[PDB]
Amino acid sequence: ALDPLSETKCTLKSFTVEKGIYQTSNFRVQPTESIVRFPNITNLCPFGE
Amino acid sequence: VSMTKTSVDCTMYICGDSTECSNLLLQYGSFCTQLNRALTGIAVEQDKNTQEVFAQVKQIYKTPPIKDFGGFNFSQILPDPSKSKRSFIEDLLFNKVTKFNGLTVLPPLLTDEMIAQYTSALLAGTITSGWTFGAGAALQIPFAMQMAYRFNGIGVTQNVLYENQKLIANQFNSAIGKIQDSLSSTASALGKLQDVVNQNAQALNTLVKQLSSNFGAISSVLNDILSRLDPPEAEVQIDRLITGRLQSLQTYVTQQLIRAAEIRASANLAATKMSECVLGQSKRVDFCGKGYHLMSFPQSAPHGVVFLHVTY
Amino acid sequence: GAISSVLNDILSRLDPPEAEVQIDRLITGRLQSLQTYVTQQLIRAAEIRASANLAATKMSECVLGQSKRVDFCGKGYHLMSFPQSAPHGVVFLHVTYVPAQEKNFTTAPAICHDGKAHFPREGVFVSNGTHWFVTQRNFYEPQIITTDNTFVSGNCDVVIGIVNNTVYDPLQPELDS
Amino acid sequence: VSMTKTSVDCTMYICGDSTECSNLLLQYGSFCTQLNRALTGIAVEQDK
Amino acid sequence: KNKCVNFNFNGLTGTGVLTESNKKFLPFQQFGRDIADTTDAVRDPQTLEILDITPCSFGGVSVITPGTNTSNQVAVLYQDVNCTEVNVFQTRAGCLIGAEHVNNSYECDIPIGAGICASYQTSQSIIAYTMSLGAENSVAYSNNSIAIPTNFTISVTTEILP
Amino acid sequence: KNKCVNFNFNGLTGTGVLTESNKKFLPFQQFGRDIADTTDAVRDPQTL
């Protein structure tokens, strides 16, 4: 996890890496805050009665 | 010539945003990674297919301003300078043919414009230099004199050509016109390329649909198992989704490698017919269309190539 | 998914009714590993067999004889081939005829001697700006246009772009001599 | 040139006259149908 | 909006990117699905607006690197994502970070995709350029000129097959 | 040594031929495994 160069070394399992392109890991934007939605929950049961 | 490059993430397909799932998936070891190396290897081979087929010319040859080729009108196959740079026929070929759930559609190395430039380079060399540019350096020669060698290659004396120079040019132009009308009248001619799209599309359609299957689990969703059931109950149910979805990857990878053999044989055939029929003359019967081979004009197509085998 | 990856570890630890549950997971996994390996080897075998047929096809056509297939055995007009053994394969040395030096010449589809159209028998007509000569498509050897090197057919009215020239008749100096 | 066209029923092979088996077989998704499509594709290819 | 985030609406949950578009929606339904039964645009549980569910930014870390004996400099290309999700240059395949865009076309040494390749050149560094399809050579052509070779060179072409 | 026999060194079960190789075991290294993560060399617990 040092740098993209080392990412290829653990992907190929070799200190020496030849010229080329190697898909080491996967890119993915992780969540940070929920955008939860509800349909304006109101008009509850008549428990006040 | 080639298929749609795809790279299916073995970890995201089996375990879509699930850490506990990956802990069980790692118990299998390299079975996950080997599937990624397989699809990665095939996608590189698809580029090699386009290279061995299309990238057969060394220099980029251009069409000269003198459009007088002895009455042979190549306007339907030469690239449109105003439009990407495709000919009228190539436009018909690309118009008659039609995300992040673990699938990654990779683009090809050669683009439609670049593949079109190879066909224009091959077409320009075929019209201007005959077949000397494929053998060695491009040696210019009049197209009327080129055709004389073509007729002589099939036992017909060159006097037959010049005796019917206008009629031969009219027969050629009319035949190309029928292909323009044929490709625009019906799309059944490109059924071969459409089948390649269907095989790749149905493979991806099946790939995505298997994610919604239970495979013996209480639910196809990973969060439902981890949330509803206990951890030790999830270890069995999540394993059913892992073992089940891994077969979908193994089936998809197995089918792609099988289709990789079909497209490779077709790519070698196209490369054989581009190296032999387009960049040269062939005495092989039924190797260039039907009849005694005169010449072949290549035309780009979606994930493929089209040969216009001119025959006597 | 098993409790341990070593078969002997499960055999030495768990009872038969408990070991068979975990051993079956290794068998199901190790079996699938061979099914994947054998599937790839079976598929890759067809790939190498296709290349082997190509090597056998290339060898017989280009080593045992002369292949007229353009750009099939090396770039250029194939002359001969010398195969060389390699580890688990073969390497061909495709000898091809390739031009190096080129020069432009004025040409024509035919020439006119006495109204009749004279076409070349083997090669094409060229010109250095002043005189016309005969030469082949693969090399420049200007030979004098003669009846033995040109064929008569039709006339000089039907041919498009035809020119005029003098044909050397070998019978002329022999009848005069 | 051609092979023996073998259209093996994916359902009858796995589940021979068993309704309980078939309901469990549906849980595997379209592996049954995909094998039939493969056995259908291989069959017509021999005719080609 | 415009960010990969978790959600839990009245009818379903998951992870996705919230966007807005002119997509229609039947008021008598809650959520929509795509051709492959994947999560598509859904109805807002609140006042009737159509929420366009765009999938989360996802790709692959395609590391461009020359041989280690040549240099340790490398470049990264995040597949099918723009640079706004994180030397920087937006390519057709993705956001290429760690390569200089060169308009001059050169021979393809490290094929990337979509007509782009890389090479370790000038001090030397990983550069990005369009794949060259050959040298531009406009061959002269006329109805009264032909090129005949005056000399030739016998070349031996090495072919390898397993 | 030099005989096909069944080994058991503190649970390290297996079968093979015993011999002295060039493996340089460190003081803390108890037993080695091959590329398959299978025990290919051990150390005698009784006498080093």
Nearest to B14 by CA among B28, B1, B4: B28
| Method of determination used here | cryo-EM
Token pair belonging to E158: 């090495």
Run of H or E including D45:
helix D31-47
CA–CA distance, E98 with E127 (Å, rounded to integer): 8
Chain C touched by B114 (CB under 8 Å)? no
SS3 string, chain E, reads: CCCEEEEECCCCEEEEEEEECCCCCCCCCCEEECCCCCEEEEECCCCCCEEEEECCCECCEEEEECCCCCCCCCEEEEECCCHHHCCEEECCCEEEECCEECCCCECCCEECCCCEEEEEECCCEEEEEEECCCCECCCCCCCCEEEEEEEEEEEEEEEEEC
CA–CA distance, C150 with B208 (Å, rounded to integer): 70
CA–CA distance, F38 with A2 (Å, rounded to integer): 31
CA–CA distance, E109 with E129 (Å, rounded to integer): 10
Cβ burial E70-99 (10 Å sphere, 16+ → b, else e): eeeebbbbbbbbeeebeeebebebbbbbbb
Q: What is the DSSP letter of B276?
A: I
Run of H or E including C111:
strand C111-112
Residues of B in contact with C70 (CB under 8 A): 131, 134-135, 275-276, 279-282
Token pair belonging to C67: 């292949």
What's the angle, vertex CA B35, arms to CA E33 and CA C19, rounded to 5? Answer: 100
Residue B85 amino acid letter: K
CA–CA distance, C175 with E55 (Å, rounded to integer): 94
Residues of B in contact with A28 (CB under 8 A): 12
Nearest to E158 by CA among B150, C96, B100: C96
Chain E touched by A44 (CB under 8 Å)? no
**C and E make contact (3+ CB pairs below 8 Å):** yes
Q: Name the residue among E111, E115, E144 with its Cβ closest to that of B111.
A: E115
Q: What are the two backbone dihedrals, phi and then psi, of residue E33, each rounded to the nearest 5 degrees?
A: -140, 160
Token pair belonging to B89: 């026929």
Query: Do C95 and C80 touch, CB atoms closer than 8 A?
Result: yes
Query: Do C76 and E155 touch, CB atoms closer than 8 A?
Result: yes
List chains adjacent to chain F, taking adjacency as at least 3 C-beta pairs closer than 8 Å. C
CA–CA distance, B183 with B96 (Å, rounded to integer): 8
Chain B touched by A30 (CB under 8 Å)? no
Q: Which residue has the tokens 């992780």?
A: A30
Contact call for B36 and A23, based on CB within 8 A: yes
Residues of B in contact with C71 (CB under 8 A): 56, 134-135, 275-276, 279-280
Distances (CA, A) of B247 to B89, B254, B284, E162: 43, 10, 45, 31
Q: Which residue has the tokens 């190396």?
A: B37
Residue B185 amino acid letter: S
Chain A with chain E: Cβ pairs closer than 8 A: 112
Q: What is the DSSP letter of F10?
A: T
CA–CA distance, E140 with B137 (Å, rounded to integer): 13
Token pair belonging to E66: 């020359």
For chain B, what is the radius of gyration of the CA atoms? Answer: 26
CA–CA distance, E117 with C120 (Å, rounded to integer): 49
Q: Which of C4, C5, C8 to mutate to test the interface with F (most CBs of F within 10 A)?
A: C8
Residue C84 amino acid letter: Q
Torsion of CA B243, B245, B251, B256, to 10 degrees: -140
Query: Do E71 and E122 touch, CB atoms closer than 8 A?
Result: no
* Burial bucket for residue C148 (CB in 10 Å: 0-12, 13-18, 19+): exposed
Q: What's CA B8's distance to the chain center, in Å?
A: 20
Beta bridge partners of B87: none
Chain B touched by A26 (CB under 8 Å)? yes
CA–CA distance, E98 with E74 (Å, rounded to integer): 7
At B306 the three-state DSSP class reads: strand
At B295 the three-state DSSP class reads: strand
Strand runs labelled E in chain B? 293-301, 304-311
Q: What share of chain A is helix, strand, coil (3-state, %, to 5)?
A: 20, 10, 70
A-contacting residues of B 24-43, CB under 8 Å?
36, 40
CA–CA distance, B281 with B277 (Å, rounded to integer): 5
Contact call for E144 and C91, based on CB within 8 A: no
Contact call for C151 and B157, based on CB within 8 A: yes
Q: What are the two backbone dihedrals, phi and then psi, of residue B240, each rounded to the nearest 5 degrees?
A: -65, -35
Cβ burial C4-19 (10 Å sphere, 16+ → b, else e): eebbbbbeeebeeeeb
Run of H or E including C112:
strand C111-112
Nearest to E116 by CA among E86, E84, E75, E83: E75
Strand runs labelled E in chain C? 77-86, 89-107, 111-112, 117-120, 124-127, 132-135, 143-144, 150-152, 163-164
Token pair belonging to C1: 């998914």
At B193 the three-state DSSP class reads: helix
The C-alpha of B45 sits at a distance from chain A's nearest C-alpha, in angstroms, of 14
Q: What are the two backbone dihedrals, phi and then psi, of residue E7, each rounded to the nearest 5 degrees?
A: -145, 155
Q: What is the DSSP letter of B215?
A: T
Residue B276 amino acid letter: E
Q: Which residue has the tokens 């090597």?
A: C55
Q: Which residue has the tokens 């059913």?
A: B240
* Burial bucket for residue B186 (CB in 10 Å: 0-12, 13-18, 19+): exposed
At F21 the three-state DSSP class reads: coil
E-contacting residues of A 7-26, CB under 8 Å?
7-8, 15-26
C-contacting residues of B 25-54, CB under 8 Å?
27-28, 31, 34, 38
Token pair belonging to B64: 């000269």
Beta bridge partners of C124: C135
Q: Which residue has the tokens 């105003």?
A: B82
> Residue A40: left if φ>0, alpha if ψ -120 to 50, beta else—which one?
left
CA–CA distance, B151 with E119 (Å, rounded to integer): 47
The widest CA-to-CA distance across chain E, in whole angstroms, is: 84
Residues of E in contact with B100 (CB under 8 A): 55-59, 80
Edge-first strand order for the sheet with E94-97 is A20-23, E61-65, E75-79, E94-97, E88-90
Chain A with chain B: Cβ pairs closer than 8 A: 7
Q: Which residue has the tokens 């061995």?
A: B52
Query: Do B57 and B125 touch, CB atoms closer than 8 A?
Result: yes
Contact call for F14 and C12, based on CB within 8 A: no
Q: Which residue has the tokens 């004009």?
A: B297
| Residue F12 CB partners (closer than 8 Å, separation 6+) | F31, F39, F42
With the C-alpha atoms ordered D23, D25, D28, D31, is the resulting torsion angle positive or negative? negative
Beta bridge partners of E117: E111, E129
Torsion of CA B235, B240, B246, B251, to 10 degrees: 170
